[PDB]
From Swiss-Prot:
Catalysis: reaction(s): L-aspartyl-[protein] + 2-oxoglutarate + O2 = 3-hydroxy-L-aspartyl-[protein] + succinate + CO2
Organism: Homo sapiens
Name recorded for this polypeptide: Aspartyl/asparaginyl beta-hydroxylase
Protein family: Belongs to the aspartyl/asparaginyl beta-hydroxylase family.
Cofactor: Fe cation
Length: 429
């Protein structure tokens, strides 16, 4: 199918095949000089330069170096600047250039390439789809929307365009309108639609409009390998870790941490309330995307295993207490923080980013009624001086319908089945 040879190229198929085969063999440094010399021999050889680029491209993957890759990105460009270039080759060259530009984070550079391709091939639908992604990657949702509307006006059933259009609509706070576009695009089974991100947004949208069918799509996502289960849907995971929504302190093995929290809870409470009264500005609003309504703030002591020195000066005894338990102060994928929630608050269902942590909640100030938290299929309430433990990689949801504020202390710990070496090796989240 691919037509990569023009008349001038058709006279050197033997030389090219050899040079090409060397790359295929894995002996790359030969293919470089091999193709490099094919330029000096015949400078107007797109396929020769295209080879050199692929060599540099493959050589980049080999050496894990961005510098040589930057070279390839230019060589792919050179291919497109030659007098007579076969269309198929021109498309392959600039597409790979755009892809590698995106890889390095040259998003606007990639966009310019994509804009060039669309100008060269004004009838290729897939290229317009790629142009749309280009706009999305620089945060230009308005131009991306126009692209996919253009596509859909010509190809109404293009699935790739539907899921992206749906995503754009959702981002513009047109939640209900986004759902059918996301549904139809996924059901089309078109290339690029079987992506966990679209299951994520589809399920999220449905839940925010009160459609209980969301879990059917989460389950399907699980079947497609996008989610660990219908409930457990975190992105950054380690395999083999025991997965259950609620834990008892004994099951975690962190019994001494739990005892220390429950026994000195009044102390932890009082330093939190003091910050409220004297430095309320230290309580920052929580995730706006997760808050449907109400007032919900947080005061952080540890973040990604990093102590906040200024914050500990406001709660010196609590920090001193926590220093003794590295399973939480060293948890690079968790936090330690006060969390205050006022009446009329609702937190949308959601999961945390990883399955490598458990989340402890110590009740500090709990109204008599109105406050509750669901994880998976079980709903519970807090108790002053008592610790709850759940795996927040499982879907959880929170309500505050009391007559006074709710204060809790949040303590993340390494998943207990993680080995010391794993706890040392994992990147931070
Ligand atoms: Mn949460």
């Amino acid at each position: 199918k691919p037509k990569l040879l023009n008349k001038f190229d058709k006279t050197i198929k033997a030389e090219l095949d050899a040079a090409e085969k060397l790359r295929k063999r894995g002996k790359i440094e030969e293919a470089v000089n091999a193709f490099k010399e094919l330029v000096r021999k015949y400078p107007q050889s797109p396929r020769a330069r295209y080879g050199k680029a692929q060599c540099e491209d493959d050589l980049a993957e080999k050496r894990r170096s961005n510098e040589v890759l930057r070279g390839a990105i230019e060589t792919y460009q050179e291919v497109a600047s030659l007098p007579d270039v076969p269309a198929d080759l021109l498309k392959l060259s600039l597409k790979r250039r755009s892809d590698r530009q995106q890889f390095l984070g040259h998003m606007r550079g990639s966009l310019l390439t994509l804009q060039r391709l669309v100008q060269l091939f004004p009838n290729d639908t897939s290229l317009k789809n790629d142009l749309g992604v280009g706009y999305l990657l620089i945060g230009d949702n308005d131009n991306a929307k126009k692209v996919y509307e253009e596509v859909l006006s010509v190809t109404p059933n293009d699935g790739f365009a539907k899921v992206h259009y749906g995503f754009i609509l959702k981002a513009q706070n047109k939640i209900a309108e986004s759902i059918p576009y996301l549904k139809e695009g996924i059901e089309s089974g078109d290339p690029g639609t079987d992506d966990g991100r679209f299951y994520f947004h589809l399920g999220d949208a449905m839940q925010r409009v009160g459609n209980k069918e969301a879990y059917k799509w989460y389950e399907l996502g699980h079947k497609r390998g996008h989610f660990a289960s219908v409930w457990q849907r975190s992105l950054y995971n380690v395999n083999g870790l025991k997965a259950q929504p609620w834990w008892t302190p004994k099951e975690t093995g962190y019994t001494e941490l739990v005892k220390s929290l429950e026994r000195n809870w009044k102390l932890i409470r009082d330093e939190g309330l003091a910050v409220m009264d004297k430095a309320k500005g230290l309580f920052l609003p929580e995730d706006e995307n997760l808050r449907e309504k109400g007032d919900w703030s947080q005061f952080t002591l540890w973040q990604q295993g990093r102590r906040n020195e200024n914050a500990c000066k406001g709660a010196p005894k609590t920090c001193t207490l926590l220093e003794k338990f590295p399973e939480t102060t060293g948890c690079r994928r968790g936090q330690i923080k006060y969390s205050i929630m006022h009446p009329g608050t609702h937190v949308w269902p959601h999961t945390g980013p990883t399955n490598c942590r458990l989340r402890m909640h110590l009740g500090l100030v709990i109204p008599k009624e109105g406050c509750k938290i669901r994880c998976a299929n079980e709903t519970k309430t807090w108790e002053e001086g008592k610790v709850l433990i759940f795996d927040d990689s499982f879907e959880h949801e929170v309500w505050q319908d009391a007559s006074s504020f709710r204060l809790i202390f949040i303590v993340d710990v390494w998943h207990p089945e993680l080995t010391p070496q794993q706890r040392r090796s994992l990147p931070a989240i």
